[PDB]
């Protein structure tokens, strides 16, 4: 099964600058008649992956005159002269040389801009959900860039934590960022068992992590 | 041009079964094949078998066999994939592809299906107010928002004061917790402009729901 390696997994490059993906195969893609059967699809966000050169020179129909192909047997590169706001998404590669067929990790190309220090907010239970009995504690770390950072609670100073949901976008339209939630989740009865609640990021914008937290509800 | 429509969503329950279809049209179809591709949550593309033309039929990829079969219908275009035994394990979206020769491999593919196996019965969301911070965090821009919990199935809409604040929001992809999901947004805007209570949270869940309001 011949495993096709891609990298790198994240490109952030500057539109209108140049980029290059490798393409790497464990066996050569060389086939008796003596093609190479490699292949590179583009999956939007939201849509189906589509053709975009084949052999592995060969533009297909209509698919502008800035990607190049290049390689031979095991290490293949696709580039790009001028990256352009229809380009970013995942690029994959493929083997046809081979069954079964196997496709590469892909390489999800985004726009590179400035470091950005997440806006940390942290929210009390909703004096209407404790009626219900669960007691969800939320926490919106907001417009940072780049993408790493780790966000941990603390319940009175313990980090025990296991209840935690995260949910993040993917790369804003406007500034280019990304935003992320973190929702610690736990009963009235829990809940009112313990006062503070931390929220604390760790992003490379602060030597210090970001903290954030507030007291009560108890006995 | 050529055109294959897939004909998808669907939601069903374990160890069930469902066959999903391709069909194609814009092209002499006995003259190619059609593969049909998996989508995980993981993300990495991977392929299941292919029927027609050069042949590992039935099903055929180590992973997929008697796990999904492939039949076709020339008289009506149409190429059929059967999933059964169904787990959770195996909500993705199935592609379905045109597989070409020299003038290499997959030139056409279908939009895509999407399943989803879940025990889950139709739950209408709790939405519940986030107001300010820590009620000691209101200086320069406020944030807000509103945690929409505990629904099934997909979607929910969210907005915030009908349409009408756009600017800052941000709602987050609903995830997964146990069988329900669960979604938030938040809404940033100028602190001397909210407590007025002039911020209302939308929500709507389509088995028949609606929104709260930021109080004081």
């Known amino acids: 099964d011949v495993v096709m390696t891609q990298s790198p997994l994240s490109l952030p490059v500057s539109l209108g600058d140049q980029a290059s993906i490798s393409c790497r195969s464990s066996?050569?893609?060389?086939?008796?008649?003596?093609?190479?059967?490699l292949h590179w699809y583009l999956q939007k966000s939201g849509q189906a992956p589509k053709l975009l050169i084949y052999?592995?020179?060969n533009r297909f129909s209509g698919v502008p005159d800035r990607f190049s192909g290049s390689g031979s047997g095991t290490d293949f590169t696709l580039k790009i002269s001028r990256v352009e706001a229809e380009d970013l998404g995942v690029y994959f590669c493929s083997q046809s040389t081979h069954v079964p067929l196997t496709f590469g990790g892909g390489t999800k190309l985004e726009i590179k801009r400035a470091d950005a220090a997440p806006t940390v907010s942290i929210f009390p239970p909703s004096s209407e959900q404790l009626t219900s009995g669960g007691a969800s504690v939320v926490c919106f770390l907001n417009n940072f860039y780049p993408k790493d950072i780790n966000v941990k609670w603390k319940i009175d100073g313990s980090e025990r934590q296991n209840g935690v949901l995260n949910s993040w976008t993917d790369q804003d339209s406007k500034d280019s960022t990304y935003s992320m939630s973190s929702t610690l989740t736990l009963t009235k009865d829990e809940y009112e068992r313990h006062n503070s609640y931390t929220c604390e990021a760790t992003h490379k914008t602060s030597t210090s992590p970001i903290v954030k937290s507030f007291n009560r509800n108890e006995c | 041009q050529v055109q294959l429509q897939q004909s998808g969503p669907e939601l069903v329950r374990p160890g069930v079964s469902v066959k999903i279809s391709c069909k194609g049209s814009?092209?002499?179809?006995?003259?190619?094949?059609i593969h049909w591709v998996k989508e995980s949550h993981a993300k990495s593309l991977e392929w299941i078998g292919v029927?027609?033309?050069?042949?590992?039929?039935?099903n055929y990829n180590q992973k997929f066999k008697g796990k999904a079969t492939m039949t076709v219908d020339k008289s009506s275009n149409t190429a059929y994939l059967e999933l059964a035994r169904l787990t959770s394990e195996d909500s993705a979206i199935y592609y379905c592809?045109?597989?070409?020769?020299?003038?290499?491999?997959?030139?056409?593919w279908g939009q895509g299906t999407t399943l989803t196996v879940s025990s889950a019965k139709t739950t209408a969301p709790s939405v519940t107010p986030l107001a300010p911070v820590c009620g000691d965090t209101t200086g320069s821009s406020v944030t807000l928002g509103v945690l929409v919990k505990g629904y099934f199935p997909e979607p929910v809409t969210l907005t915030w004061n009908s349409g009408s604040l756009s600017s800052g929001v941000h709602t987050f992809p609903a995830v997964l917790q146990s069988d329900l999901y669960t979604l938030s947004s938040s809404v940033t805007v100028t602190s001397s402009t909210w407590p007025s209570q002039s911020i209302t949270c939308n929500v709507a869940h389509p088995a028949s729901s609606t929104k709260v309001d930021k109080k004081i």
């Open positions: 066996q050569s893609l060389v086939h008796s008649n003596g093609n190479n059967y």
């Open positions: 052999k592995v020179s």
């Open positions: 029927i027609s033309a050069y042949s590992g039929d039935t």
């Open positions: 814009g092209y002499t179809f006995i003259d190619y094949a």
């Open positions: 592809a045109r597989g070409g020769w020299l003038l290499l491999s997959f030139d056409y």
